Design a protein around this ligand. Structure first.
Ligand code: 8A4
Length: 223
């Protein structure tokens, strides 16, 4: 891959993300700044466990269909076979939604945007899984410390999808060829404007998988 192809690949990844960002950063920080009142937070707490999972699953499902639209717009993804297309999405689509919900978590007050205002993990007590909500708050609190830009998570969410390990993979080599073209493209745009020590950390590994636990599996039952 030549020099100018990497620059055209980097441009296409952020081009796909800016169209599939779903909420656009600007309004997320614009409503920092609008926090649920004490009467409003109890209204969400007062909802039944079924009522709140039915809302959260609708949020989760609608956020994944943007991730697929993100995946369908990458330069190179559609060139893989559709067997590899599903199996990369099945494994990764939920993993990037957490990485995308990094946007609209506010590390100043430890709150998260949800349906118009900013809440905090006591907003989601109706799910009955405070251990899972607390630990995704910990995940987003770690991402916010790196001060991720818009084009930076565009590349990063693409590398979470394009993983050439996984289970299945008919054209395993064709995945590695696209993965290599994106991870060098990630380090190229990174070397420009000198942000080289957000790479030395970048978790270690495995915690991104650990929070896709047995609470958010199947989950068809909800309307
Ligand atoms: C941290 O708790 C949450 N934070 C959220 C923050 C934002 C949004 C979001 O949908 C949104 C989604 C994507 C982008 Cl880019 C922007 C906004 C949204 C808010 N307002 C409008 N929208 C569209 C939903 C959240 C949800 Cl559902 C939860 C609960 C929850 C979290 C995780 C799991 N889970 C499942 C598997 C593992 N864990 C279950 C339930």
């Amino acid at each position: 891959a030549s020099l100018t192809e990497i620059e055209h690949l980097v441009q296409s990844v952020c081009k796909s993300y800016r169209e599939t960002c779903q909420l656009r950063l600007e309004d997320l920080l614009r409503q920092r700044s609008n926090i649920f009142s004490r009467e409003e937070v109890t209204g969400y707490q007062r909802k039944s466990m079924w009522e709140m999972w039915e809302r959260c699953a609708h949020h989760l499902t609608e956020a994944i269909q943007y991730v697929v639209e993100f995946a369908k717009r990458l330069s190179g993804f559609m060139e893989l076979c559709q067997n590899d297309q599903i199996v990369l999405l099945k494994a990764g689509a939920m993993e990037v939604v957490l990485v995308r919900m990094c946007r609209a978590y506010n590390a100043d007050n430890r709150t998260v945007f949800f349906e118009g205002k900013y809440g905090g993990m006591e907003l989601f007590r109706a799910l009955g899984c405070s251990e899972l909500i607390s630990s995704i708050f910990d995940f987003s609190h770690s991402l916010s410390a790196l001060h991720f830009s818009e084009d930076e998570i565009a590349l990063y969410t693409a590398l979470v999808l394009i993983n050439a390990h996984r289970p299945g993979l008919q054209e395993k080599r064709k995945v590695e060829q696209l993965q290599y073209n994106l991870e060098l493209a990630f380090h190229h745009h990174l070397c420009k404007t000198h942000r080289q020590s957000i790479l030395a950390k970048l978790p270690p590994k495995g915690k991104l998988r650990s929070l896709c636990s047995q609470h958010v599996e199947r989950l068809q039952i909800f309307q």
